[model samples]
Target chain A: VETISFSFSEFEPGNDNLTLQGAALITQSGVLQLTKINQNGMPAWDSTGRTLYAKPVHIWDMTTGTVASFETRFSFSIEQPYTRPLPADGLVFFMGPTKSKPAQGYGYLGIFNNSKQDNSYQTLGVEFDTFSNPWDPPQVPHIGIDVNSIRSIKTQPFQLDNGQVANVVIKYDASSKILHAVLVYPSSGAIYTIAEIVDVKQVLPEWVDVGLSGATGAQRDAAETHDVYSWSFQASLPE
Target chain B: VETISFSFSEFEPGNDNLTLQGAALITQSGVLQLTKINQNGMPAWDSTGRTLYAKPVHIWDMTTGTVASFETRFSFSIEQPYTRPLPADGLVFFMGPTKSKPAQGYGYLGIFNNSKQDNSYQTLGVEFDTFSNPWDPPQVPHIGIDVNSIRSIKTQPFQLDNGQVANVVIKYDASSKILHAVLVYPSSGAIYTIAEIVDVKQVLPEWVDVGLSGATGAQRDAAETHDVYSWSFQASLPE
Candidate 1:
């Protein structure tokens, strides 16, 4: 058996190991800024997202049919400046084909793009949605389990405060084909959970890139800042 | 460099890997019962604590002066029967010499024994105190950091409800010599944090046994049952 584990308590500036694309950058306070607010106090028209981890994880062995089990814990905050009436878009913790790129446009969460045909880009993700799109449930802010599409297979109501940091845990058990996601608001200790039984091999390749991403849309006044304070991941594979 | 990672979502009966002592046992539902209520409806007079892990961890190499960094996350609950007026004793997540045995007596949290002289045990622990002792701070329930003594060096109030599962994360950075503990209540999303800087080499041996322990006292009716639902640990060592 082989095990892999890594943790970033805070992202330091000039840290080359992380792959930051678009407007993502490490702040002076060591927080990972997924969506940056421009000097004019508005979000960029393009997507503001990227893969935070530099390397792809060994998720499965195609020849041996051995899959890996993994777990990740992270703390993040979705902050909107007082000027903004509402928070736009949100963020996702995802696993996608190594060739996958950040998606563009609104409400994609940088994981899916409507321009592509459904299921064309294999991806599995847990999304924290702040803006409710027409495809989303009636709840404005929620947690969703996504498979290859922006419309989540399952979703649960999740409330997010402007500046409150939330702690989240995501776990996948290969043997049981169960994927679970849990979110906790640190200030209130309120929790939200969602899970599904997913055979990852059907949705992703043997080798995949796993990281976090976020996006903002044309509604500049609704854009919010996403900050990740800490993250840790662990996976075990049977050789 | 080497990394060690392990997780137990729930403990199962007939699992020989875990080292259970005293009244500790795996429940029918797979929860780890550190303090069990007996057929007579009372706690055992002796300590009900045990080391949950089977092997010792390589915490540091004295020959090379290289220390290890570690982080652990777990979920647990403290439940008192309706008949009990107050909770008795508490639990501890600790690292001690490989030969260290569970301490006997109340309020020890299975980490320290009053029978021995001060500082003889050489243990490092983070305690979740449910009952207030004379040495404890004015707070009735709190989180404390202990170094070879039952009296914590620092403490912060942490309220735990009956039968409420609490999520806790403890991290130690070898480079910074800082140990931090965070507890979150899933129901309220409430959080409490406490931290301290201590050189591990000054208090613990190169090789140590790491695990969780709990204890109950002479007041049988005041005893509370402790259950651990899940736990995960990760450590990185320098060659």
Candidate 2:
């Protein structure tokens, strides 16, 4: 019933009042940092392996008791140490049923159930993949849309002219049942469309939750951070 | 306009995507802990001093440009140690202009300006004072209603069964312009009405920001922690 815009400017890193389902924080510079320097004293994933986090602020619509179409604008940056190889895993803008909980936080973009038989769950995900695992689309960092598999429905290599930060906007067109996404690089003023049309409602639940997730793997000794500068969403449930 | 409910059970402390304006964290027990333990091996305030955290989720009427009436039910616990001289500088549930930012977070409950001239501004505050500071109505930990100034309009000594967790219900009656508050101690099944009436609209801006704030002072070596078990609000805008 409301369109909410969130600015992380007021939050403190490491210890803040954000209600997330994974590891997250607002950095001192006012960025929503999904991972911090590990306890072993390095800016990398914890020695515990991959981590996934979600925000379930709301998903239900009391007005009609159904999932609503939503449009979101969020800016994020994925980074690794210059000395290390590219960061493994990546980030995702995901939507799923209220009761759905992802099984794996690593390569699955925190959307899949992790079981070979029941891999297809009720979720729609747009992923930013940095590692080229054996199951990925190709051997390069890319942005893709997924239904329930790491095998994306559509994908494009993740690129930036300066290779620093990227701004992204994702929207669901209710009338056409299409999910659209666009990424922009401020350094080079370059823009790319990662997703054109993927029927989200076909696989997602009527009452769905929306949020973001990111991960890292031991395949690369690199520490990566997912930083969200700002996020805003417009949501409206249909009768 | 919308009325939203936040469930802490879905949240993780330290690293969740909660949009807040200050330092906060969720506890493993599903409670919202505003402040965390200091790095120096103590349950104290952060080294940066007092903090102001706000939720931009919003409960205001855009058409009228004023805040809506709201009724909230919540439970919390504030404690330092049995060894220390009780927790100093308690907490406050407050609503003020979106532009209103407390000047200090130490002894002022993180709501009022700590200056001599520009203290009382435009806001309505319900304070839980643990340490009796100068300018207070009387000595002892008490509950009071404040309008911009710490010099409360009404006050009552803090009293509970055994001083554990406290349940509170705060409501704003749009017709009467009254802000009422009720507190209960579940451990003893005892209840108290600390505040009955305060004309919130008379002193506060029409559209305001609402949240809670707590602080610890250098004047006291004792460290304290404020824990929020749950919070829910029902809001509606008036014509």
Candidate 3:
């Protein structure tokens, strides 16, 4: 079968096949925490994180020019004390080559490295950014479509409340070559949407790793806990 | 000289070197009008238009890996009788292969043809779209960044007042690989901005034709006159 499908109601130590790097870890409560909180003395750049499915999936076949259409939905929450400064950095759902590793702090979003001059990295991501870097649009707490770069090609203003679980749905339509992202806040019923036409075969390899990543910047007090409560993903490749 | 620069405060006959295609024309008043309006019986698809510099410029060097940093600013106005329906289509600042031609009706924006299945077209455009197409985001009257396909990868909401001259500035920074487009409504001082990182060397050929294009849909009554009042462009290529 040329299909990959899986669902995780809660991530447990022995149940899920996941590769965690940097600050990513599975908590005793069965939640996947992407970054640490209250670590005041740790070096700032060391807080970058990554969590990927251990087995790589065939995203597209360069030889056959066959591409896979996929959908992923996840529920996540960010928590920090109200008295501390607002959250620094954010989270992203990304698909990159199997060899990819978590990048440095904050703005890189764990998908890109310090080699900004080299545009050879092949990655596609949808980011839920809480911090505004120089490369980002003026708005903060926004959703963006990133193509091969941390600087988003498209962005939509989004609102996030502390300690709220947000539902996110991302889908790619192979027929139209369009990637769509939807963000919904359960408490407020607020919905934000964005899309872009991305030809997967042009940017990604045949086999790729799909995962979620989060990061924290230099301000230790502003660090927030990134938790994934549930996740599901499915992809269908051509026969 | 490794630079190209030109200015057209007014496009007078026999002075500016511009190639007009399809319905594009230069009026007696020195304005470059992209599409014809008020032709009640003409076929709807015949309204597509294009206007480009007659000479092609070196946008990038594939062999040497040198790309040009460029800037273009233009003032334009869309005019239709207030009693008539709203504008059916829009205009774009585009750079494409030298052999490219005006495409079919409204949604293509005169930059992409009927070949939606073929993603091989090498073009980059900043579109000021007045009408919403199926592929477009829900917001009507917006600006978008188009890479290869007419379906934009990035978009921002924009407002256009009928008959008002709108000032637009588009620049590509080679060092950052970022393309920024800014729109200003002189009458109200309102401004809209959007940007994306586009490595031109990855999409277009060594030489390209830089131009403006506009189109109208099936609703002939909704046809609006697209005009360019002034334009200036400059490009610096590496030695």
Candidate 4:
């Protein structure tokens, strides 16, 4: 028997898998819920804005060199946990320091929790949004990647029946500085690939936690849920 | 004496120092004008959201290792050269290959020109915007740095009275992958620094063409001007 000392969240069918922060938990039936839906009711702006975070063991470290690569796969869904027009704000899967949290309205998700005037804050995440806040260019259901701020560097339409079910495959090719995310709607097996060139080490800490976040807003009221069925994460082999 | 024959856009006080592109040119005496007061009327949206660019000789190349440091200084202004409440779009100083133009409405500033869905578009730029668009979170006179899209990875209010003039100092520490920009208003001597982490090669070719771009909108009718008083550039010495 070998104890790796790494209490990693393997996404296996189990309940005691992650370290919950704010509004997150593992159900007895083995599902991950990011927020309890309107727990704080239109979480006020600034620190008043509550962010739900579920953290896993540190996965990739920059000390491993400038080219740390990884592949992650998971089945997830976003639902109006409460009964409202849709869901406010949205959801995001990220790799950041233990301090990362949700903040602002649905548009900012907790990763960019604190409203900053500059890029002094650091973070990296992928966001799935429902309601179109006036600030976001795309008003339709979409997915985007975030760094420091919830503002997306790249955005693509991620149309699912109700933001309830989708399979996501994420890969980072460090040598090529490219990030590819493929989302599949299991019902129809329809696939869409969102790709971009990004340098991971440039926007994150050498050692970081990996997890997800969700949010709601004042304009509309709804219970938002970020449910995960299965997930797997692994770093690339040493060069 | 060996002549490299590299005619840089020297910090000369004459209009013939730089090469012209689109509706840009150096005045007979001095000063850079990106768009003449009423060149193409209030540039319409869609294809009509025109992008005016000015080219300068190549300055820095990535082949010189990661410590490729450089300091550039220039004075600029963004004003509706015509009579209007404010300018719709903005202007940018970028380093890309031969591509990169203006598209969409105001947020893009032509650096992420053509409305790309991903960061695959290759280019790096600093944008100065006067108008507020729904897509932009900050609705103030702001300055931001963009990679492949007009969506700024880092942004800050570029507060200046009357949009008359601002001195800019840009520096890149390739080793740290840190890019810093400082804007100084000559009138009040107020300074604001905007910093972000960015890779030189990730969004640009090994060698690149440096220049400027400016655009206007129909709702607002003003002569948009991007004037550069003086500029200088130098790469780090060999390791």
Say which candidate scores most in lDDT: 3
Please report, in order, the local distance difference test score of every candidate based on alpha carbons.
0.78, 0.59, 0.79, 0.57
Model 1's CAPRI class? incorrect
lDDT of 4 by residue, A54-155 (tens): 433343454546445676667777655445555566677777666554445445666665545235555777777766765565555677766666667767
How do the residues B1-239 of candidate 3 rate in per-residue lDDT, one tens digit apiece?
37998899888866658988888888788988888754562323348888999889888887778899898989999765545565668889999889677766688888787535344778888998887888888887899999888788889897778789887878777866767666766575455656667889888888999999988766646677788998889988894
Comparing 1 and 4 on DockQ, the stronger one: 1
Give the CAPRI class of candidate 2: incorrect
- Cα distance off (Å), candidate 1, residue B124: 0.3
lDDT of 1 by residue, B95-186 (tens): 88885666665788877766333666888989888788888887867898898788888787977777889998887768757676677776
Please give the distance, in angstroms, between residue A45's alpha carbon in candidate 3 and its true position after superposition. 40
Tens-digit lDDT track of model 2 for A134-229 = 667674578887776667766768573433667676766454454556666656544455434445545655455666777766554655667677
The regions of model 4 sitting more than 4 angstroms off are: A1-16, A37-64, A80-86, A99-105, A114-117, A237-239, B1-239
Model 2, stretches more than 4 Å misplaced? A1-239, B1-11, B14-17, B39-42, B45-67, B99-102, B115-120, B160-163
As for candidate 1, its clashing pairs are A188-B188, A188-B189, A188-B190, A189-B188, A189-B189, A189-B190, A190-B188, A190-B189
TM-score of 4: 0.43
Regions of model 1 farther than 4 Å from truth: A1-239, B40-47, B82-85, B115-117
Best by DockQ: 1
Whole-model alpha-carbon lDDT for candidate 2: 0.59
Q: 1 or 4: which has the higher TM-score?
A: 1
lDDT per residue as tens, model 1, A1-239: 77888899888898877888777888788988888767885455445777557777888888899999898989998876645556678888999878566676468887777734366578888988878788888886889888888888878787776689888888776876767666777676555555566788888888888889987756546777778999999989896
